[PDB]
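Sorry to interrupt, but I need a hand with the structure work. Could you add the entry underneath, on a fresh line?
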Amino acid sequence: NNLKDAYADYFTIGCAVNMANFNSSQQIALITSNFNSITAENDMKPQPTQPAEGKWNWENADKIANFARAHKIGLRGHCLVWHAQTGDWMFHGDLVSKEVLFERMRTHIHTIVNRYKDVVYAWDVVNEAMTDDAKAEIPYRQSLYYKIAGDEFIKKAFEYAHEADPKALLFYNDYNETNPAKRDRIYNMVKSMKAEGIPISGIGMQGHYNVLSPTEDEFRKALELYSQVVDNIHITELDVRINTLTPEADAAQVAQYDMLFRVMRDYKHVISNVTFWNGYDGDSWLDQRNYPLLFDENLLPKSSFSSYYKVL
């Protein structure tokens, strides 16, 4: 009886998976025991699935989706539109017009959402569109997407995704979600886009936190703020690194996870999903120096697993 059962009344619990996860038996036993949602770590992003116009690459995404269908695990669809891990061919060599970008965008969104809408219950439609912080000047990350189409590519992405599966939750997804300047900008854009009618179902807080990172004041400020503009929130790539093996680090980590999950339970009426960004300390994208997750290098539960699991 893992995380998913302890949190049944509160929200789903997910992890991001890759081909090595969906490989070995002990790892699969860890994820089936503990998670009722899954996100594809890499194999559903734009460059991996459409490395060239019309050259779709479905193999790894199919295996993950088949895992989610067969094993009755919900699947978060990670990443329709992103300045990163996207083919440079999407934009250009000379820069394409708005119209051409939008035709490229609509074709990519509608092709992949229709392949997976049977399992996918939520999508990160737009990823990381706002700038890191510095009312006046532009709030938007100055990617090629923004350069070509301004604000408008964010609007289009949600409308194409909603067009391709109207029953899916569509998330705006971002990191540094607790930083106040960036927090305020994520709030405004989502408020203004929902006001123009664009179908932004919910906000994705990435949760790439650390052992002192977000103070629970900041965490709570972000959650309440975001809560007044969307009916759904997902904590979408949660890890808390111990940096910036010892018994002291473990205590600091146990303490952050206790607070982090304390506030999240307090906002269980907005939070539908809490997903961690890899599987175990040994396959964390940060590499083993940061020890970010609740399972250790040998898949064993950490001190923070038991602290988050035993509440009330």
